Ligand binder design. Sequence first.
Ligand SMILES: Nc1ncnc2c1ncn2[C@@H]1O[C@H](CSCC[C@H](N)C(=O)O)[C@@H](O)[C@H]1O
Ligand SMILES: Nc1ncnc2c1ncn2[C@@H]1O[C@H](CSCC[C@H](N)C(=O)O)[C@@H](O)[C@H]1O
Ligand SMILES: Nc1ncnc2c1ncn2[C@@H]1O[C@H](CSCC[C@H](N)C(=O)O)[C@@H](O)[C@H]1O
Ligand SMILES: Nc1ncnc2c1ncn2[C@@H]1O[C@H](CSCC[C@H](N)C(=O)O)[C@@H](O)[C@H]1O
Ligand SMILES: Nc1ncnc2c1ncn2[C@@H]1O[C@H](CSCC[C@H](N)C(=O)O)[C@@H](O)[C@H]1O
Ligand SMILES: Nc1ncnc2c1ncn2[C@@H]1O[C@H](CSCC[C@H](N)C(=O)O)[C@@H](O)[C@H]1O
Ligand code: NA
Ligand code: NA
Ligand code: NA
Ligand code: NA
Ligand code: NA
Ligand code: NA
Lengths: 248, 248, 248, 248, 248, 248
Amino acid sequence: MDIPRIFNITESAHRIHNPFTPEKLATLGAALRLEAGARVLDLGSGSGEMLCTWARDHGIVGTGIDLSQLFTEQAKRRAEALGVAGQVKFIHGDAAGYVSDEKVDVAACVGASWIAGGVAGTITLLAQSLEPGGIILMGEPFWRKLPTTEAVAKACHANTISDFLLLPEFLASFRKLGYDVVEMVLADQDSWDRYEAAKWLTMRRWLDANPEDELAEEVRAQLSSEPERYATNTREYLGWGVFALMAR
Amino acid sequence: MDIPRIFNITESAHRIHNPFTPEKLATLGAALRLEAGARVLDLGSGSGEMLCTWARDHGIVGTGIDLSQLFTEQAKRRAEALGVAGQVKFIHGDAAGYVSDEKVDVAACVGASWIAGGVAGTITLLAQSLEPGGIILMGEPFWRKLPTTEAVAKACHANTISDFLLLPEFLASFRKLGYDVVEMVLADQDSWDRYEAAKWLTMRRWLDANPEDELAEEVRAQLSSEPERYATNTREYLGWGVFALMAR
Amino acid sequence: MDIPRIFNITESAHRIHNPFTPEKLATLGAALRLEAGARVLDLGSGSGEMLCTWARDHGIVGTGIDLSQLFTEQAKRRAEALGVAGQVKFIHGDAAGYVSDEKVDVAACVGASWIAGGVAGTITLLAQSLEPGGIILMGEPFWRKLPTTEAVAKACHANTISDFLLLPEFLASFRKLGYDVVEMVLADQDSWDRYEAAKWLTMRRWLDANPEDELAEEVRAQLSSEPERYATNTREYLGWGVFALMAR
Amino acid sequence: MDIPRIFNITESAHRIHNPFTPEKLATLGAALRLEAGARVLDLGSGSGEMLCTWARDHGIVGTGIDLSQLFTEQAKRRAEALGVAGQVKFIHGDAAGYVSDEKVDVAACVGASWIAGGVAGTITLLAQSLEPGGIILMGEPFWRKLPTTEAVAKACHANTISDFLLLPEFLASFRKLGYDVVEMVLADQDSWDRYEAAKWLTMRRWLDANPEDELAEEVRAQLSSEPERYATNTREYLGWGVFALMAR
Amino acid sequence: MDIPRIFNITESAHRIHNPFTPEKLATLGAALRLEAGARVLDLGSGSGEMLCTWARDHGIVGTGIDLSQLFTEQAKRRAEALGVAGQVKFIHGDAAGYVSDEKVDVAACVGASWIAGGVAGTITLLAQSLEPGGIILMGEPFWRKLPTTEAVAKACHANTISDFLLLPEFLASFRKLGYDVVEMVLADQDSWDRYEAAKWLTMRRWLDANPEDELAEEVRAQLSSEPERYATNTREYLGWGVFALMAR
Amino acid sequence: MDIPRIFNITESAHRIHNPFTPEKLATLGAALRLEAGARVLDLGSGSGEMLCTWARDHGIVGTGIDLSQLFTEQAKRRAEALGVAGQVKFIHGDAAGYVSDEKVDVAACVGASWIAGGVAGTITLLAQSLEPGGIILMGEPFWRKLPTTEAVAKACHANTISDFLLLPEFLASFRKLGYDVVEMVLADQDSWDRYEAAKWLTMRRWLDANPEDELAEEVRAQLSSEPERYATNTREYLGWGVFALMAR
Ligand SMILES: Nc1ncnc2c1ncn2[C@@H]1O[C@H](CSCC[C@H](N)C(=O)O)[C@@H](O)[C@H]1O
Ligand SMILES: Nc1ncnc2c1ncn2[C@@H]1O[C@H](CSCC[C@H](N)C(=O)O)[C@@H](O)[C@H]1O
Ligand SMILES: Nc1ncnc2c1ncn2[C@@H]1O[C@H](CSCC[C@H](N)C(=O)O)[C@@H](O)[C@H]1O
Ligand SMILES: Nc1ncnc2c1ncn2[C@@H]1O[C@H](CSCC[C@H](N)C(=O)O)[C@@H](O)[C@H]1O
Ligand SMILES: Nc1ncnc2c1ncn2[C@@H]1O[C@H](CSCC[C@H](N)C(=O)O)[C@@H](O)[C@H]1O
Ligand SMILES: Nc1ncnc2c1ncn2[C@@H]1O[C@H](CSCC[C@H](N)C(=O)O)[C@@H](O)[C@H]1O
Ligand code: NA
Ligand code: NA
Ligand code: NA
Ligand code: NA
Ligand code: NA
Ligand code: NA
């Protein structure tokens, strides 16, 4: 099995499947003070950009599990291209209930927390793989500012305003779970632009090539509506970041 | 050991050590559809009013653990007075890490969640005592409305506004923990008045009797300031309720 | 025929199918100054709680018509349980166009006014059964405060904001129909909680028992979303009450 | 002498001539921790509901003075009906300057403070009857929220906004007089509804019976206008409560 | 009998006794798609401008009843002046309870609904004269925008804000009565100016001619105050229109 | 081919298929200073009211293309009725890509700009038919005021708020295209009422005649909801006008 086809089409040219730039991803690697040889587990690892670049830049080793066949293949090509295939392994499969045999120094789920039914569930899962004194990484949305209506929330892929919290309350929610927040690297509007806008070029080039595809009608509708939807709703209201956690 | 002396002085005449009336407490018992013989565990059971009245009215049995020696003694006198000592047992002691040998149908912590380091920790503790298909009860504050300043928060015994959530987000926080909210009974302003205002009469009568006590100066200052503090801050801004939870 | 199955599932454990507590229902009985022997007609009588309790407490007699087979059966069991079956009769059927042969002192429709196509139509219908000098009872929603968006209205089971009025304008609407408002008993937030929150426990227990039912998917979705929806929309914005009317 | 006829007509069926329910009145009795044998003086005692019910429920004894002949007669019938005539005495007369020979444990004026020219004057009067260590009870209005215009104030039976204070400032005003506030029981909107709405049924039934009375025109005008006036002005803006005071 | 003298003085030179221009009145005639021979009943027909002009322009026939002797005489002169006396009949008298013997295609009350005690009563009366498939016309005020204070309402000849509704809620009120709104023609500020400002010239010319009349003092006061009152209150806040209704 | 059936049903009795009165349409003709013999092309000409009335009043000649068979037939009957069939020709067909052989003095698209994929596309198309020094006419919506939510936009037949602009920005958009705005005639609320309200009478009369039509259910739902929807959304927020353009 796989993820739905439309995601593979829309994000086929993304290295990072989230609102983070390469510069943010490198900032995060350095913020974690990763040492050579550190072991990383990444559940929902996308196209392996985090593991591949940290292997290259910090000498880490690790494993990435992802449900997408396409993105798994990209991750493997990426590790070859960077010269780090010896350090990082990519597995195509479902990461639900995944627990590592050898403990890791960093256990991450960067924007895939439905794997264990939400943020708390995912933290509990990742904790099972974690070396005492290690770090858990959660990549998650929050309100950059509070939407004025529930409709802005539904245009940001939530059901209600209560699905997300403003940053102080979101940070508080990790504390209330039992964790210290020990680091964080947040998206800014420019990093959101990178994630969203790149989909538009990808979609248009796909559409030009696939005018009689069963999905061409749907894609054409998305391409038409997305820039304005994104600018009106997401760009102003939706925050995102990676939060580093250690259990008290 | 015990709780600090000032709490015993201020609340010596309270049956319910929270912003709930007798009528709210009975509403809660009926809302839970308690059957005769149902087993209840109550961590931080106060003066045993919940266990004693539900024993009388619904035929439940149970155990209440409380750190206060005074309130434990009151709970035992209450059970005798109601004719339910055969059904409900009160233990003087620290409820931290308390796990029941026999499972219970209802496992409760009504305004004492620091016992396991917060709401999530306490839910996890209570779950260890719970019969499959049972209910967890959490009695907790939330924002009735959002304070306009951090100072209102500090006047409501929080450190920051982020310590509490508005009701929709608070309900969402239980869902995000993995629980369905299956019932709730909330304080209203009248029930808050019962909890707070009763302290003033108690304090004044204590003060009249104990003019040379080491605490008389402190109590005199509290009595003077409390009604206005309460009316300005708590009465308008601070919500409270009991939430009934079942793990999904 | 019957009402849709989902209502029978959700409300199977409700005595009162509206945002009124037992205490509100008793307040209403006393507010009407009901005399022993007074005759009451109740169209859309639910589980007969109003007729049964007023029979017990005030010595009234009457008839309740309801389309639900389940709720009719409950009403009949309730009258037996209270010792008032001699005083109150429950009929399973459609109350549209129902006119009593003997006149009544109180003719009521408590939250079922679609029976005669709305509030005005229902008042006109009930008037046909009414003794000169009798009282008409209408149980109806109104805006507790004005929603800020049409979406809050649609989340409160209206189509538009104009479907309901703020209380002064709603009271004015009865006056403009030709009636004096002679009494009223309104829901508060606690009574709304009783009506809504009780559905959640009922639904969860049903779901646990009926995992392969054709409705399990729908019920699971409702249970997940309802507490937050209710707290965000209904609890703050939607009013409800019973209004007592006499024609000028 | 007597009170004006219109008040006797409008309130002839009220047990409590203020925005308090029976449940609030009983809450107040218990909040005061009244002991059997405690002596109560009630100036402007209405229909004696406070004295009669506290005699029945707490074993108090006392005296109620009221200017209304009707309400005095009702109070005497009430004490007989409850079996407490031996404990409570009702006197028809003017309570201005009334000082008790035997001291009392509770000296009350519940919504009649014009007797001594206002709140401060009335407190000073009641203090003359009070046992050292006793409680003074004042039943008084305040702003539940601040009216936006002087016209809302005049529709709430004040002359100006400055006639009343918001609750914190009102509580402060007792402190500034020299008293600790030691307890309080406040009206809510439901208790206001009980007080106001009951007048409408009373008025309509009176009007039906007295179509050619000199007051029928005035009463008809009041009945027409009151529900909307009440809902627009009083229900949202006007607070009321009973405050228990002890001199510092 | 007649209407009070001051109205006859103020409006003696008006053809249309409402905030409608001739152009609005003609728009309304065409909007109703009146056919030659259609029968119209007009209760409170003023100076007969609606009947006379529709007779001339659409070939309708009809009857107008008005309580003013003056305005009845004007209506009769108007029908002669337009050459339509054969088509339209004006009757001086009270239109309360008026029911036509022959049914009509259009039954109208344009700003005189106190005749049957309000909008609903008047609709019910007009319905008695109506051919199945005919139209009822109601000319009524509503809030163009919501006044900020009750005083603006009293300056617009209402008692309270709740006397009128904003247009969406007003339209909803007809729907809730059982009627489809099938057409409407609304006043604008210019049509209000025509109705109000014309009174000022009339009043001044009357005053110049009648300096010792018993009403000269009152008229002088009105003339002085009206333009500013009108501009401050009515022109911005008060809406008006004619609504065409058909029973569902 | 044709337009969908529902439009033909709803607008069968409209001469002007837009929020313009006859008086606005005549104002526009005079504003353009049309000379006898001037040639006009009208793409999406509706029922030909613009061409027919300008032929009659200004002596213009022209051609109207419309996709509706019904509205084309009406246009031809209209030209006969006005005595201008010699001057104006109506063609049933698709106006997309339509370019005139003889140049015209006025090239118009009045509320049909989807013909060339929007305002800019339509201007470019019309320009191909235009005599140097001629005028292009575009009939288009804009925001009369900015909706407070995207839902108001969707209730005004847009997808997002960004679909339309406030008038200054809308006028700027023509300037930014390369055109001077040389004249304009805008709808007001009364002209919107004419366009929308007339649909309600048409729909009701259709419904009365066609109770078993496949569309009766849909039409009944529209008739019920439209007046309130229109008053809440369109009447206050949606602007419309005809803008006269000359290329710089
Ligand atoms: N059950 C599952 N197990 C593993 N991966 C899953 C999954 N469900 C979804 N995914 C993957 O979760 C990812 C979410 S996008 C984030 C990917 C990556 N962390 C990055 O930032 O680039 C997708 O790559 C998708 O393929
Ligand atoms: N570590 C601990 N173990 C058990 N009880 C504790 C405790 N720390 C505080 N408490 C108790 O927690 C209670 C908080 S007040 C709430 C008490 C009770 N549930 C009621 O509603 O009336 C106090 O009674 C206090 O004695
Ligand atoms: N046409 C109809 N005739 C009679 N009852 C109807 C009906 N349509 C719906 N109902 C009933 O109307 C009720 C609405 S709920 C309110 C029920 C009751 N008055 C109470 O307050 O508890 C339901 O019990 C439903 O069964
Ligand atoms: N001068 C006076 N002396 C005694 N009673 C007076 C008075 N002037 C007014 N009253 C009484 O003051 C009362 C005010 S209403 C409040 C009555 C009562 N405390 C209750 O809550 O029900 C009326 O009963 C009226 O008769
Ligand atoms: N009881 C009654 N019966 C008939 N006409 C009445 C009436 N009471 C008032 N009127 C008339 O109602 C009218 C209100 S003014 C509106 C008049 C007319 N429809 C127009 O628009 O011009 C006045 O002409 C007044 O004379
Ligand atoms: N492709 C197309 N070619 C020509 N006319 C079209 C069209 N698509 C829609 N229309 C027409 O465009 C019109 C939009 S309504 C406006 C019509 C006219 N200008 C008036 O103001 O009255 C309708 O008459 C419809 O029939
Ligand atoms: Na940036
Ligand atoms: Na309350
Ligand atoms: Na309450
Ligand atoms: Na209440
Ligand atoms: Na105008
Ligand atoms: Na206008």
